[PDB]
Ligand SMILES: Nc1nc2c(ncn2[C@@H]2O[C@H](COP(=O)(O)OP(=O)(O)CP(=O)(O)O)[C@@H](O)[C@H]2O)c(=O)[nH]1
């Protein structure tokens with residue numbers, strides 16, 4: 311059976327590093343690593359460095375493609391100080407590590423030789439505000455496709471990829487659990503834009519951000535593991551994020567281990583798990599690279615799209 | 618508002634021919650032209666020749682892409698007598714002209730300088746046989762996604778694009794209105810494969826043939842026009858195809874104009890129109906090039922994806 315995909319173990323994948331230099335310190339890694347994440351410099355070298363080599367091979371190759379369409383159209387030569395931005399999507403469940411994966415990726419690419427402008431945007435900022443979610447009866451479906459302003463999202467990425475000087479995204483506050491009035495993240499003709507969220511790989515009856523991705527990753531793990539990671543993070547957060555009296559979820563800080571486990575499981579069951587099974591997982595087949603994690607968070611398997 | 622798309626009129630589009638030679642005679646065109654189609658050598662020159670220039674620019678460019686992934690993987694050099702097959706999808710309603718568009722495209726590309734092997738496959742052969750459609754209660758939904766063996770279809774195109782020496786498709790008989798026992802269409806590592814059908818541009822919870830297309834066309838027209846074309850073709854066929862006593866639809870040959878119009882409208886209303894509105898039209902946003910036809914079948918407008 312021929313296949314669009316090729317499967318690697320960590321042994322096979324890490325050979326593909328060739329001579330890519332490691333440009334990240336252990337301390338720098340910490341600044342990027344999320345609560346509960348196990349990524350170390352060795353995963354960076356054995357997993358993220360071949361990745362970064364793949365990507366940089368494909369950035370130049372993907373530029374030929376837009377150049378052919380320019381040539382056809384009898385369009386001028388593209389300013390080499392403004393190529394067409396390479397767009398990278400990163401997807402997966404809540405709690406699977408995908409935001410760290412994306413932050414690490416950004417760090418690695420920014421440190422490539424010619425110092426590319428590499429911006430990172432999460433879909434959080436494109437959530438409808440709570441007052442608007444409440445209007446729509448969606449206050450308990452944050453993360454589902456319909457809880458996002460997908461039109462604004464598509465506009466944002468279309469703007470950036472189509473060469474705009476600047477494009478703006480709104481900004482979400484996890485502390486306050488809402489969009490921040492007046493806050494903008496401004497992206498200015500970067501060379502690479504990484505877009506990370508749950509359903510960014512979705513497809514449908516209109517052109518969507520996934521149709522603009524030049525490359526995508528999906529961070530995968532067994533569902534039962536993800537839940538464990540999610541519950542455990544929730545318990546840990548009683549003394550980090552929920553401890554802040556300003557935090558929308560401050561009431562959780564004083565939950566017993568057992569009360570906390572019960573609350574987190576209920577949130578997993580009613581929100582995150584269904585969103586995962588119904589919307590996120592069905593996008594996995596399309597990702598250029600699936601990063602498969604074991605129960606201990608360690609990436610030991612990879613699936614690349616060769617077609 | 619920035620846009621993934623650029624819109625042309627025939628004036629703007631035909632300028633993009635540059636010096637592409639016309640290699641098709643009027644007689645050759647006839648061999649390709651479907652009952653009721655108005656395509657002439659002038660549409661070929663003003664519409665299909667820029668198209669063919671776009672495509673050939675993108676074939677070489679799209680090869681860089683697969684080469685980068687080979688390089689990354691430390692794969693050998695690709696035999697230049699066997700590149701990775703460029704896959705082209707052609708979609709649209711029944712009766713809109715898309716099969717002629719595809720046959721013409723094949724003729725034009727086969728006549729490019731180095732004489733590329735250019736195969737053409739329609740999704741007809743991947744319809745479930747009638748006995749199997751009946752089992753599924755689908756004898757009146759031929760053309761809807763579920764009336765096709767989509768797994769076999771995906772396998773076929775995956776086989777070809779992944780470099781197989783040969784791949785086989787079953788063969789449908791319009792005369793008999795069923796799959797022909799024992800018949801195979803054999804495709805042998807072509808340089809380009811054109812795949813044409815109603816829903817070939819569809820997307821979903823699994824990797825599908827649209828995810829393998831390097832380029833796609835959608836042949837568009839106003840729904841009311843398509844219906845007129847469909848009814849008129851049905852009336853014309855009383856003296857061509859339905860006239861054959863072997864034809865599954867021979868009974869239609871003896872319909873009055875008015876009986877025929879009533880039968881065709883009913884088939885349009887209950888089968889083709891719903892399939893168009895529900896399944897085919899929602900794929901239009903993704904096509905690389907939409908060919909928009911006026912009431913007289915003439916292509917006067919085009920929409921290209923630049924992103
Ligand atoms: N305080 C806070 N920050 C969050 C939360 N969710 C995501 N973040 C932001 O994203 C980072 C998480 O890194 P990582 O563990 O890779 O995130 P993830 O696996 O995508 C977890 P989730 O998808 O649940 O956010 C956090 O360090 C923080 O910057 C949250 O619930 N609370």
Ligand SMILES: Nc1nc2c(ncn2[C@@H]2O[C@H](COP(=O)(O)OP(=O)(O)CP(=O)(O)O)[C@@H](O)[C@H]2O)c(=O)[nH]1
Nearest residue numbers: 651652654710711712713714715716717718791858
């Ligand atoms: N005899 C016959 N041939 C058909 C039929 N439908 C498609 N074909 C094949 O496809 C060709 C049609 O050319 P074209 O007019 O572009 O097809 P189309 O617009 O896709 C029409 P449809 O989609 O309804 O087949 C025919 O000449 C024939 O080879 C049909 O109902 N009867």
Ligand SMILES: CC(C)(CO)[C@@H](O)C(=O)NCCC(=O)O
Nearest residue numbers: 404405540541543544547559577
């Ligand atoms: C469970 C964690 C810590 C992991 O992301 C986080 O999703 C969380 O608990 N956030 C606040 C609770 C909530 O998700 O509503």
Ligand SMILES: CC(C)(CO)[C@@H](O)C(=O)NCCC(=O)O
Nearest residue numbers: 711712847848850851854866884
């Ligand atoms: C209406 C035409 C002639 C146009 O394709 C053709 O679709 C047709 O009439 N075929 C046989 C009738 C049927 O579609 O069942």
